[PDB]
Amino acid sequence: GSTKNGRDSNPKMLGVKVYGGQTVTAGNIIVRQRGTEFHAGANVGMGRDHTLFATADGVVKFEVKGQFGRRYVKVET
Amino acid sequence: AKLKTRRGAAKRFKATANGFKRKQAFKRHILTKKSAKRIRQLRGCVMVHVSDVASVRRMCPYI
Amino acid sequence: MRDKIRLVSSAGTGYFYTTTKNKRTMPEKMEIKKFDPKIRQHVIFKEAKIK
Amino acid sequence: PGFEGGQTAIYRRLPKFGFTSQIALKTAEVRLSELSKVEGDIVSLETLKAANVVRRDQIRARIVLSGEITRAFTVQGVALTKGAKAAIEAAGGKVE
RNA sequence: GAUGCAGUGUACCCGCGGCUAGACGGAAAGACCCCGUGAACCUUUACUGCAGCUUGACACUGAACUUUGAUUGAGGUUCUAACUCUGUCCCGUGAUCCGGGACGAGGACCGUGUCUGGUGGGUAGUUUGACUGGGGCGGUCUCCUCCUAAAGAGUAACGGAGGAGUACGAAGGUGCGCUCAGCGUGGUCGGAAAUCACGCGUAGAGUAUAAAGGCAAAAGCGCGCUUAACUGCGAGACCCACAAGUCGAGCAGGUACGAAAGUAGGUCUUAGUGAUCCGGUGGUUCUGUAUGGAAGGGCCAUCGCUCAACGGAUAAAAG
RNA sequence: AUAGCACUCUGCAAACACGAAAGUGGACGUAUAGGGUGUGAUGCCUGCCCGGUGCUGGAAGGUUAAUUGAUGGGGUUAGCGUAAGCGAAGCUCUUGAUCGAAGCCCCAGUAAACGGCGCCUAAGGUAGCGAAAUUCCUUGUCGGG
RNA sequence: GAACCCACUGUCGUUGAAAAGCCAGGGGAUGACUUGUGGAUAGGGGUGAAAGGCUAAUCAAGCCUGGUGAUAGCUGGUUCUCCCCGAAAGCUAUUUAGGUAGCGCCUCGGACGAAUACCAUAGGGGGUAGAGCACUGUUUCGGCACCGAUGCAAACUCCGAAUACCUAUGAGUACUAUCCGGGAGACAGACUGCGGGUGCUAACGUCCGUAGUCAAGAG
RNA sequence: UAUAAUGGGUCAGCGACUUAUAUUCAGUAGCGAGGUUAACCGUAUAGGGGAGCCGUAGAGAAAUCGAGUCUUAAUAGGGCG
């Protein structure tokens, strides 16, 4: 006979692009994510596809905050 | 004999100061579904890629 | 099925947008206010055949 | 050359654009410094052709500000840019 | 699958007569099998062309008299001068060719030239995909979600499992307002399960659609007003052999909703798709083969492919 | 292959064949003759189906090729307008009114035409024969040798 | 049943006496018979009591010359010496799979020089090994869909390493790293160890990731 | 691949990356913001022959402008110089 499987989708290259302690410029993308695994803090904007980008020049920092305990990424000038 | 130009390529490529300019694809007929950003950004000319510059040079010797 | 259609400016400049509609649920002709670059103002646009 | 193993070629997957202008073939461009080759004080289409800075089959010429000139000229029936006209006047020439 | 390598055993040097177990013995670049975008011949309701046959219009092609239809156009009946005779007679001539002359039988028919519809394996040039634990048969060829995937990205098998080729002028934008679902108690023909009050625990509800990642400033739910489902762009970055793809602060113009700070460049996101050539439509301060126009061409917007063998040999192809 | 049989075509300048034509064979023959096709002495015989394809005859009802060229639209050309611009003959570009045969569609006949002989079709095998030059199970079963 | 014309069986021959025969048998032999001389039919043609038979030892399209040196992604071959460097058998696309093109890997020149690499320290994300039952699914024993105990999972997770990866600073040791241009080859890999799919926890089996050797390397 | 995979019985002689044209890069020589002739004439490698070609300016489909130019309502922003 034959098999009904044998299909897959092309890769999407998701994940973190700039790690904590690094330097960024305004407009640099920091996180590529399907959902909001990370949220935006100061000087970080969110795109329509949930991408996180930097709106200011500085140093990236990750943190855990809030009652929900969700993770935030921000830029320090 | 003299080298002959590939007229099909000569009709798609023009010469600039340091390279070649070209038009972009995906703007001819199917346009309703395409977004306005794509419509505007695909307009105008761009530059030939370095990897493909050599073939254009071979096909268009005198330009 | 959805059919393509044209929205032509009322100002007569000839500017037009293109969209789609469901004929079963929208028999009536489409009105909509849109911006016209040629005369740089907001004016009404009328449904018309995509042609 | 231009065969990529069967995939649609670069020169065939891009669109054609533009058209050729006939008058551009007969239009001629002349640098300012080339007027030194001219013999005499009168700069015209005929004199440029005689000096061999313009091909015989051309029907009009234009002068652009490219080099420098240390002579006085009178230009007749030749188009001049703003900079070229200023340079000619500074060098002590005239137009028409 | 060893006279020639390793370890061992046997064997003084050379003929003649016989034998065929081996020297993957000699002989013919395997005919069997598969491949090459090779060859030939044969078949057909494969593609395409032609000979042959056949329909009509114009020409060769003329005269007279009559009938009937929607000024014309279809017939019929006679005639002889074009034209046919592989019919008789006379001559060139000594001749079953041919030519001319007379007669006879036909006759505006038949037949031929040009054009045109149909038929056309009679003949001719060709085509008839790839992957594949050999080939064929079967299945598959493009896109999205999870696992394989070894805690950054990427990563194969005819490996294991599911979806897609849409929908919506509101299911878009904005201001304001509200949280699901599940159980325990009493009530009408209504009870396992129909509407309604209180109370308990808790997100199991929902999110147009498959799954994953998400969702309280709710991204879930309702109401009023509206068209930012705009135009010109665009610092910077992700991904990428190319062609392509993706996110985006910010500036100018005109808008919608808010008292206002302000939000809005389609919808929680990731599938819903097709390059080039050719042609159609609306504009266009471009070009216009002597000159003025026009035709044609260019530029902006947009329309026509299941080209799914989905980077798409030709417009058109089986055994 | 054959003698025999049957179907079909051919009225003579025959049908058919060769050839580019002229012309030649058929035949210096004339339906008791000539060509094509199938079966294959002889004896007894040769069932059903015209739905499909082909052939034959009829019908004139729908579709139209060349040809012909109604009407419409466009470019240019004259004269007029303060100005909006209005705008003809002629030439030229383009459109396709009407006329128009076969062929196709339609009806009937034809099987010693090709072909078929399992509720449905067009109808589902008359005579004769039969594990056969046809039988897979199969060295089917019974008798003779 | 002789001559004459044929070719049914068997032996011999198979570098033969012979590129089709001899010997012993066999069939027709007044006929649709055999045979001499001279003529006609010519290659997509001729002829054929029909085998694709014959057409000069040649026939599913004769022979000779010319187009012609046809094309062949296929097979073979490619000739003196020394010095330096030194690969790949991968990704993407293809009427593409034993061909080819861009990228990756090699070499030479120019430009440019530590902007590079190893290690130490500092900062940063994770969801694999392991483990667990708080979600999903599944398993057994008890007391009332629940409660107690117990076990399992690539497509389960309340948890969670070592390694690996990114960024900054620094000692030492290494002419490193990047850019522009000329010339390539290569796109059939093999075994072994480790983490796996497939298979029978089979294959000198097959398909991935990762390191070593062979390929191209002797002792 | 010792392979039981291919080719060669032996010797002597013959036997395979060429030629013309165009173009691109490198080395070398002349001249230098300039460089160079072609056909042709010429008792002819001389001398003459400046038509032509490359370089000296880009942008834009084009008109056009020009150290600027295209896009746009925009001296904004951006692309190519």
mmCIF file of C-alpha atoms (C1' of nucleotides) in Angstrom, chain E:
data_model
loop_
_atom_site.group_PDB
_atom_site.id
_atom_site.type_symbol
_atom_site.label_atom_id
_atom_site.label_comp_id
_atom_site.label_asym_id
_atom_site.label_seq_id
_atom_site.Cartn_x
_atom_site.Cartn_y
_atom_site.Cartn_z
ATOM 1 C "C1'" G E 1 35.220 -18.455 -3.926
ATOM 2 C "C1'" A E 2 43.876 -17.354 -3.900
ATOM 3 C "C1'" U E 3 49.864 -21.103 -7.935
ATOM 4 C "C1'" G E 4 51.515 -15.568 -6.090
ATOM 5 C "C1'" C E 5 49.143 -12.888 1.165
ATOM 6 C "C1'" A E 6 49.821 -15.601 6.563
ATOM 7 C "C1'" G E 7 50.628 -20.385 9.094
ATOM 8 C "C1'" U E 8 51.683 -25.051 8.096
ATOM 9 C "C1'" G E 9 52.429 -30.083 4.904
ATOM 10 C "C1'" U E 10 54.697 -32.352 0.891
ATOM 11 C "C1'" A E 11 58.200 -32.071 -3.162
ATOM 12 C "C1'" C E 12 65.635 -34.386 -6.924
ATOM 13 C "C1'" C E 13 66.015 -32.132 -12.678
ATOM 14 C "C1'" C E 14 63.511 -32.892 -18.060
ATOM 15 C "C1'" G E 15 60.242 -35.606 -21.612
ATOM 16 C "C1'" C E 16 56.315 -38.930 -24.299
ATOM 17 C "C1'" G E 17 50.982 -41.285 -24.368
ATOM 18 C "C1'" G E 18 46.257 -40.092 -22.256
ATOM 19 C "C1'" C E 19 42.395 -37.042 -19.336
ATOM 20 C "C1'" U E 20 39.477 -32.518 -18.678
ATOM 21 C "C1'" A E 21 38.567 -30.983 -12.201
ATOM 22 C "C1'" G E 22 40.652 -25.492 -11.984
ATOM 23 C "C1'" A E 23 43.241 -21.647 -14.184
ATOM 24 C "C1'" C E 24 35.808 -17.033 -12.298
ATOM 25 C "C1'" G E 25 39.693 -21.134 -19.747
ATOM 26 C "C1'" G E 26 39.157 -18.977 -25.537
ATOM 27 C "C1'" A E 27 35.435 -16.923 -28.651
ATOM 28 C "C1'" A E 28 31.501 -11.989 -29.511
ATOM 29 C "C1'" A E 29 32.507 -3.564 -25.474
ATOM 30 C "C1'" G E 30 25.530 -9.129 -22.491
ATOM 31 C "C1'" A E 31 20.347 -9.939 -26.625
ATOM 32 C "C1'" C E 32 18.068 -10.772 -20.145
ATOM 33 C "C1'" C E 33 17.398 -6.081 -16.525
ATOM 34 C "C1'" C E 34 17.864 -0.694 -15.787
ATOM 35 C "C1'" C E 35 19.479 4.363 -17.785
ATOM 36 C "C1'" G E 36 20.176 8.315 -22.062
ATOM 37 C "C1'" U E 37 15.108 14.655 -21.899
ATOM 38 C "C1'" G E 38 19.394 7.964 -28.150
ATOM 39 C "C1'" A E 39 17.525 5.202 -33.133
ATOM 40 C "C1'" A E 40 14.248 2.757 -36.040
ATOM 41 C "C1'" C E 41 9.612 0.438 -37.634
ATOM 42 C "C1'" C E 42 4.163 -0.599 -36.402
ATOM 43 C "C1'" U E 43 -0.851 0.945 -34.167
ATOM 44 C "C1'" U E 44 -4.684 4.428 -32.831
ATOM 45 C "C1'" U E 45 -11.175 7.895 -30.961
ATOM 46 C "C1'" A E 46 -2.355 11.023 -28.758
ATOM 47 C "C1'" C E 47 -0.669 16.388 -31.125
ATOM 48 C "C1'" U E 48 0.133 18.744 -35.712
ATOM 49 C "C1'" G E 49 0.512 19.042 -41.341
ATOM 50 C "C1'" C E 50 -0.416 17.314 -46.355
ATOM 51 C "C1'" A E 51 -2.152 14.080 -50.742
ATOM 52 C "C1'" G E 52 -6.913 12.118 -51.967
ATOM 53 C "C1'" C E 53 -12.409 12.800 -51.914
ATOM 54 C "C1'" U E 54 -16.191 16.224 -51.485
ATOM 55 C "C1'" U E 55 -19.514 21.415 -50.545
ATOM 56 C "C1'" G E 56 -20.242 26.368 -52.070
ATOM 57 C "C1'" A E 57 -18.609 31.651 -54.455
ATOM 58 C "C1'" C E 58 -16.014 34.142 -58.631
ATOM 59 C "C1'" A E 59 -14.037 33.111 -64.125
ATOM 60 C "C1'" C E 60 -14.156 30.306 -68.545
ATOM 61 C "C1'" U E 61 -20.274 31.317 -69.444
ATOM 62 C "C1'" G E 62 -24.331 32.739 -74.162
ATOM 63 C "C1'" A E 63 -30.098 33.694 -76.197
ATOM 64 C "C1'" A E 64 -35.362 33.435 -75.563
ATOM 65 C "C1'" C E 65 -40.010 32.157 -72.864
ATOM 66 C "C1'" U E 66 -42.346 31.103 -68.270
ATOM 67 C "C1'" U E 67 -43.731 29.752 -62.522
ATOM 68 C "C1'" U E 68 -43.165 31.066 -57.462
ATOM 69 C "C1'" G E 69 -41.121 33.415 -52.830
ATOM 70 C "C1'" A E 70 -39.002 37.720 -49.214
ATOM 71 C "C1'" U E 71 -36.419 46.303 -55.344
ATOM 72 C "C1'" U E 72 -34.082 40.791 -55.279
ATOM 73 C "C1'" G E 73 -33.354 35.390 -56.020
ATOM 74 C "C1'" A E 74 -35.092 30.276 -56.676
ATOM 75 C "C1'" G E 75 -36.562 27.419 -60.168
ATOM 76 C "C1'" G E 76 -38.523 25.292 -64.780
ATOM 77 C "C1'" U E 77 -38.986 24.789 -70.457
ATOM 78 C "C1'" U E 78 -36.676 25.534 -75.212
ATOM 79 C "C1'" C E 79 -32.288 27.172 -78.466
ATOM 80 C "C1'" U E 80 -26.829 27.135 -80.275
ATOM 81 C "C1'" A E 81 -22.565 29.842 -81.198
ATOM 82 C "C1'" A E 82 -18.295 28.697 -76.141
ATOM 83 C "C1'" C E 83 -17.348 23.624 -74.800
ATOM 84 C "C1'" U E 84 -17.258 17.287 -74.756
ATOM 85 C "C1'" C E 85 -17.099 12.762 -77.884
ATOM 86 C "C1'" U E 86 -11.786 6.612 -76.186
ATOM 87 C "C1'" G E 87 -18.922 8.102 -82.894
ATOM 88 C "C1'" U E 88 -19.215 8.010 -89.020
ATOM 89 C "C1'" C E 89 -16.911 10.048 -93.567
ATOM 90 C "C1'" C E 90 -12.869 13.135 -96.580
ATOM 91 C "C1'" C E 91 -7.753 14.853 -96.907
ATOM 92 C "C1'" G E 92 -2.000 15.386 -95.064
ATOM 93 C "C1'" U E 93 -1.140 9.574 -96.129
ATOM 94 C "C1'" G E 94 1.209 4.183 -97.997
ATOM 95 C "C1'" A E 95 -0.962 5.595 -90.809
ATOM 96 C "C1'" U E 96 -6.571 2.333 -85.015
ATOM 97 C "C1'" C E 97 -1.062 8.719 -83.330
ATOM 98 C "C1'" C E 98 -2.020 13.631 -84.489
ATOM 99 C "C1'" G E 99 -3.988 18.001 -87.357
ATOM 100 C "C1'" G E 100 -7.740 20.167 -90.506
ATOM 101 C "C1'" G E 101 -12.789 19.763 -93.115
ATOM 102 C "C1'" A E 102 -18.157 17.728 -93.120
ATOM 103 C "C1'" C E 103 -21.891 15.220 -90.291
ATOM 104 C "C1'" G E 104 -24.165 13.211 -85.878
ATOM 105 C "C1'" A E 105 -25.171 12.783 -80.399
ATOM 106 C "C1'" G E 106 -24.660 16.076 -76.159
ATOM 107 C "C1'" G E 107 -24.464 21.344 -74.320
ATOM 108 C "C1'" A E 108 -24.296 26.586 -71.056
ATOM 109 C "C1'" C E 109 -24.278 21.250 -68.253
ATOM 110 C "C1'" C E 110 -19.863 18.281 -67.372
ATOM 111 C "C1'" G E 111 -14.804 19.844 -66.503
ATOM 112 C "C1'" U E 112 -10.683 23.094 -65.183
ATOM 113 C "C1'" G E 113 -8.071 27.806 -62.314
ATOM 114 C "C1'" U E 114 -8.446 30.846 -57.638
ATOM 115 C "C1'" C E 115 -10.770 31.004 -52.897
ATOM 116 C "C1'" U E 116 -13.527 28.370 -49.025
ATOM 117 C "C1'" G E 117 -16.214 24.592 -45.153
ATOM 118 C "C1'" G E 118 -16.163 19.236 -44.161
ATOM 119 C "C1'" U E 119 -13.684 14.366 -44.216
ATOM 120 C "C1'" G E 120 -8.871 12.699 -44.030
ATOM 121 C "C1'" G E 121 -3.444 6.634 -39.861
ATOM 122 C "C1'" G E 122 -3.567 7.007 -46.923
ATOM 123 C "C1'" U E 123 0.969 9.437 -45.975
ATOM 124 C "C1'" A E 124 4.653 12.608 -42.935
ATOM 125 C "C1'" G E 125 7.183 15.011 -38.440
ATOM 126 C "C1'" U E 126 6.819 14.384 -33.469
ATOM 127 C "C1'" U E 127 5.379 13.576 -28.187
ATOM 128 C "C1'" U E 128 3.973 10.174 -24.367
ATOM 129 C "C1'" G E 129 7.382 13.789 -16.424
ATOM 130 C "C1'" A E 130 10.163 12.729 -11.933
ATOM 131 C "C1'" C E 131 10.765 10.301 -6.945
ATOM 132 C "C1'" U E 132 11.154 5.044 -5.813
ATOM 133 C "C1'" G E 133 15.794 -0.170 -0.862
ATOM 134 C "C1'" G E 134 15.822 -2.749 -9.411
ATOM 135 C "C1'" G E 135 11.724 -1.580 -12.742
ATOM 136 C "C1'" G E 136 6.375 -1.868 -13.222
ATOM 137 C "C1'" C E 137 1.413 -1.331 -10.348
ATOM 138 C "C1'" G E 138 0.055 1.749 -6.090
ATOM 139 C "C1'" G E 139 1.195 6.490 -3.583
ATOM 140 C "C1'" U E 140 3.350 11.403 -3.835
ATOM 141 C "C1'" C E 141 4.988 16.487 -6.239
ATOM 142 C "C1'" U E 142 2.819 23.487 -3.540
ATOM 143 C "C1'" C E 143 1.617 25.753 1.660
ATOM 144 C "C1'" C E 144 0.499 25.588 7.526
ATOM 145 C "C1'" U E 145 0.867 22.988 13.021
ATOM 146 C "C1'" C E 146 3.299 19.062 16.431
ATOM 147 C "C1'" C E 147 7.108 14.974 17.200
ATOM 148 C "C1'" U E 148 11.479 12.732 15.417
ATOM 149 C "C1'" A E 149 15.353 17.473 16.557
ATOM 150 C "C1'" A E 150 20.481 15.519 20.871
ATOM 151 C "C1'" A E 151 17.393 22.909 26.515
ATOM 152 C "C1'" G E 152 20.290 29.016 20.477
ATOM 153 C "C1'" A E 153 19.206 28.527 14.623
ATOM 154 C "C1'" G E 154 19.122 24.570 11.123
ATOM 155 C "C1'" U E 155 18.820 19.252 10.383
ATOM 156 C "C1'" A E 156 16.821 13.216 6.470
ATOM 157 C "C1'" A E 157 13.667 8.584 5.418
ATOM 158 C "C1'" C E 158 7.693 5.520 0.445
ATOM 159 C "C1'" G E 159 9.200 8.026 9.356
ATOM 160 C "C1'" G E 160 4.683 9.064 13.237
ATOM 161 C "C1'" A E 161 -0.050 12.440 13.412
ATOM 162 C "C1'" G E 162 -3.436 16.510 11.525
ATOM 163 C "C1'" G E 163 -4.992 20.900 8.389
ATOM 164 C "C1'" A E 164 -4.929 24.575 3.665
ATOM 165 C "C1'" G E 165 -6.239 26.570 -2.134
ATOM 166 C "C1'" U E 166 -11.283 30.417 2.603
ATOM 167 C "C1'" A E 167 -14.434 34.113 5.539
ATOM 168 C "C1'" C E 168 -15.831 39.174 7.114
ATOM 169 C "C1'" G E 169 -18.420 46.736 5.206
ATOM 170 C "C1'" A E 170 -18.481 44.084 9.936
ATOM 171 C "C1'" A E 171 -16.198 39.356 12.286
ATOM 172 C "C1'" G E 172 -12.259 46.660 10.666
ATOM 173 C "C1'" G E 173 -11.270 51.665 13.827
ATOM 174 C "C1'" U E 174 -12.401 54.288 18.237
ATOM 175 C "C1'" G E 175 -14.939 55.715 23.343
ATOM 176 C "C1'" C E 176 -17.526 53.396 26.982
ATOM 177 C "C1'" G E 177 -19.300 49.149 29.635
ATOM 178 C "C1'" C E 178 -19.278 43.340 31.063
ATOM 179 C "C1'" U E 179 -16.607 38.426 32.410
ATOM 180 C "C1'" C E 180 -16.852 32.513 31.241
ATOM 181 C "C1'" A E 181 -17.902 27.524 32.000
ATOM 182 C "C1'" G E 182 -19.175 23.653 36.286
ATOM 183 C "C1'" C E 183 -22.028 22.223 40.522
ATOM 184 C "C1'" G E 184 -25.709 22.602 45.509
ATOM 185 C "C1'" U E 185 -30.449 24.284 46.812
ATOM 186 C "C1'" G E 186 -36.814 25.890 45.311
ATOM 187 C "C1'" G E 187 -39.992 26.679 41.714
ATOM 188 C "C1'" U E 188 -45.486 25.932 35.187
ATOM 189 C "C1'" C E 189 -47.750 21.467 30.963
ATOM 190 C "C1'" G E 190 -40.277 22.014 31.209
ATOM 191 C "C1'" G E 191 -37.735 16.654 32.572
ATOM 192 C "C1'" A E 192 -30.640 13.868 32.695
ATOM 193 C "C1'" A E 193 -30.841 18.503 29.668
ATOM 194 C "C1'" A E 194 -35.727 24.240 28.393
ATOM 195 C "C1'" U E 195 -36.353 30.370 31.400
ATOM 196 C "C1'" C E 196 -35.499 32.492 36.603
ATOM 197 C "C1'" A E 197 -33.031 33.606 42.691
ATOM 198 C "C1'" C E 198 -29.129 32.645 45.978
ATOM 199 C "C1'" G E 199 -24.554 30.034 47.375
ATOM 200 C "C1'" C E 200 -19.695 26.909 46.654
ATOM 201 C "C1'" G E 201 -15.093 25.696 44.265
ATOM 202 C "C1'" U E 202 -12.487 27.283 40.155
ATOM 203 C "C1'" A E 203 -10.550 28.651 34.958
ATOM 204 C "C1'" G E 204 -11.482 23.403 32.711
ATOM 205 C "C1'" A E 205 -15.556 28.711 28.780
ATOM 206 C "C1'" G E 206 -14.298 31.473 24.538
ATOM 207 C "C1'" U E 207 -11.074 33.081 20.890
ATOM 208 C "C1'" A E 208 -14.701 32.192 12.117
ATOM 209 C "C1'" U E 209 -11.122 27.601 10.872
ATOM 210 C "C1'" A E 210 -6.220 22.304 12.151
ATOM 211 C "C1'" A E 211 -2.430 22.469 15.931
ATOM 212 C "C1'" A E 212 1.328 25.239 18.662
ATOM 213 C "C1'" G E 213 2.657 29.549 21.076
ATOM 214 C "C1'" G E 214 -0.631 33.187 23.656
ATOM 215 C "C1'" C E 215 -4.709 36.011 25.733
ATOM 216 C "C1'" A E 216 -7.133 40.756 32.689
ATOM 217 C "C1'" A E 217 -4.859 47.305 30.093
ATOM 218 C "C1'" A E 218 -8.222 40.730 28.439
ATOM 219 C "C1'" A E 219 -6.340 39.240 22.303
ATOM 220 C "C1'" G E 220 -13.066 36.793 25.266
ATOM 221 C "C1'" C E 221 -18.328 39.607 25.351
ATOM 222 C "C1'" G E 222 -22.069 44.200 24.114
ATOM 223 C "C1'" C E 223 -23.546 49.238 22.795
ATOM 224 C "C1'" G E 224 -23.137 54.340 20.021
ATOM 225 C "C1'" C E 225 -20.448 56.855 16.197
ATOM 226 C "C1'" U E 226 -17.635 55.858 12.170
ATOM 227 C "C1'" U E 227 -14.119 54.129 7.434
ATOM 228 C "C1'" A E 228 -6.617 54.537 9.376
ATOM 229 C "C1'" A E 229 -9.436 47.722 5.113
ATOM 230 C "C1'" C E 230 -5.827 56.117 3.811
ATOM 231 C "C1'" U E 231 -1.821 58.968 0.395
ATOM 232 C "C1'" G E 232 3.594 60.213 0.132
ATOM 233 C "C1'" C E 233 7.408 57.829 2.739
ATOM 234 C "C1'" G E 234 10.574 55.558 6.284
ATOM 235 C "C1'" A E 235 15.907 55.641 10.909
ATOM 236 C "C1'" G E 236 16.877 50.609 12.057
ATOM 237 C "C1'" A E 237 16.816 45.389 12.348
ATOM 238 C "C1'" C E 238 15.203 39.555 11.290
ATOM 239 C "C1'" C E 239 15.653 35.814 7.351
ATOM 240 C "C1'" C E 240 17.836 34.685 2.944
ATOM 241 C "C1'" A E 241 22.350 31.215 -3.109
ATOM 242 C "C1'" C E 242 19.170 34.390 -6.195
ATOM 243 C "C1'" A E 243 14.347 35.647 -7.222
ATOM 244 C "C1'" A E 244 11.738 36.721 -2.848
ATOM 245 C "C1'" G E 245 9.802 37.088 2.466
ATOM 246 C "C1'" U E 246 9.104 39.635 7.558
ATOM 247 C "C1'" C E 247 8.911 43.612 11.877
ATOM 248 C "C1'" G E 248 9.211 48.622 12.426
ATOM 249 C "C1'" A E 249 10.127 53.879 15.742
ATOM 250 C "C1'" G E 250 9.449 58.398 13.217
ATOM 251 C "C1'" C E 251 7.944 62.925 9.454
ATOM 252 C "C1'" A E 252 4.120 65.643 5.988
ATOM 253 C "C1'" G E 253 -1.170 65.711 4.261
ATOM 254 C "C1'" G E 254 -6.430 64.451 4.927
ATOM 255 C "C1'" U E 255 -9.608 61.694 8.417
ATOM 256 C "C1'" A E 256 -12.710 58.722 12.442
ATOM 257 C "C1'" C E 257 -13.554 58.167 17.647
ATOM 258 C "C1'" G E 258 -12.482 60.784 22.619
ATOM 259 C "C1'" A E 259 -13.455 66.308 27.537
ATOM 260 C "C1'" A E 260 -8.416 64.931 27.208
ATOM 261 C "C1'" A E 261 -3.347 62.254 27.437
ATOM 262 C "C1'" G E 262 -4.410 59.411 23.038
ATOM 263 C "C1'" U E 263 -5.629 55.158 19.580
ATOM 264 C "C1'" A E 264 -6.172 53.552 14.324
ATOM 265 C "C1'" G E 265 -1.470 52.233 7.713
ATOM 266 C "C1'" G E 266 -7.393 45.613 8.355
ATOM 267 C "C1'" U E 267 -8.910 40.928 11.735
ATOM 268 C "C1'" C E 268 -4.287 37.226 18.518
ATOM 269 C "C1'" U E 269 -0.274 35.308 15.088
ATOM 270 C "C1'" U E 270 1.757 31.537 12.121
ATOM 271 C "C1'" A E 271 -1.818 28.364 5.819
ATOM 272 C "C1'" G E 272 -6.097 30.666 2.081
ATOM 273 C "C1'" U E 273 -1.079 30.812 -3.249
ATOM 274 C "C1'" G E 274 1.541 31.748 -9.297
ATOM 275 C "C1'" A E 275 7.504 34.646 -11.802
ATOM 276 C "C1'" U E 276 8.253 36.126 -16.980
ATOM 277 C "C1'" C E 277 6.030 36.907 -22.179
ATOM 278 C "C1'" C E 278 1.232 38.509 -24.512
ATOM 279 C "C1'" G E 279 -3.181 41.026 -24.385
ATOM 280 C "C1'" G E 280 -7.778 44.278 -21.825
ATOM 281 C "C1'" U E 281 -9.418 48.742 -18.810
ATOM 282 C "C1'" G E 282 -8.784 54.221 -15.919
ATOM 283 C "C1'" G E 283 -5.287 58.164 -15.816
ATOM 284 C "C1'" U E 284 -0.735 60.362 -17.801
ATOM 285 C "C1'" U E 285 3.095 68.107 -17.556
ATOM 286 C "C1'" C E 286 6.610 61.370 -21.317
ATOM 287 C "C1'" U E 287 7.526 60.040 -26.735
ATOM 288 C "C1'" G E 288 5.262 60.937 -31.632
ATOM 289 C "C1'" U E 289 10.213 58.404 -38.061
ATOM 290 C "C1'" A E 290 9.801 66.069 -42.822
ATOM 291 C "C1'" U E 291 6.234 69.579 -40.100
ATOM 292 C "C1'" G E 292 0.834 69.879 -36.975
ATOM 293 C "C1'" G E 293 -2.110 65.849 -35.422
ATOM 294 C "C1'" A E 294 -3.316 60.952 -34.954
ATOM 295 C "C1'" A E 295 -1.878 55.677 -34.683
ATOM 296 C "C1'" G E 296 1.588 52.958 -31.964
ATOM 297 C "C1'" G E 297 5.162 52.890 -27.607
ATOM 298 C "C1'" G E 298 6.559 54.250 -22.335
ATOM 299 C "C1'" C E 299 5.032 55.444 -16.847
ATOM 300 C "C1'" C E 300 1.274 54.978 -12.433
ATOM 301 C "C1'" A E 301 -3.253 51.762 -10.982
ATOM 302 C "C1'" U E 302 -5.650 47.471 -12.161
ATOM 303 C "C1'" C E 303 -7.812 42.662 -15.011
ATOM 304 C "C1'" G E 304 -7.074 37.441 -17.736
ATOM 305 C "C1'" C E 305 -3.544 30.751 -15.762
ATOM 306 C "C1'" U E 306 -5.625 23.768 -10.893
ATOM 307 C "C1'" C E 307 0.905 26.945 -15.823
ATOM 308 C "C1'" A E 308 -1.485 21.740 -8.435
ATOM 309 C "C1'" A E 309 4.584 17.804 -12.318
ATOM 310 C "C1'" C E 310 2.544 24.479 -7.978
ATOM 311 C "C1'" G E 311 11.107 28.279 -10.091
ATOM 312 C "C1'" G E 312 5.920 27.760 -14.336
ATOM 313 C "C1'" A E 313 10.288 23.056 -21.988
ATOM 314 C "C1'" U E 314 5.954 24.843 -27.102
ATOM 315 C "C1'" A E 315 0.301 28.376 -27.916
ATOM 316 C "C1'" A E 316 -0.972 22.967 -28.847
ATOM 317 C "C1'" A E 317 1.050 16.149 -27.683
ATOM 318 C "C1'" A E 318 -1.138 8.520 -26.559
ATOM 319 C "C1'" G E 319 0.547 3.304 -27.229
#
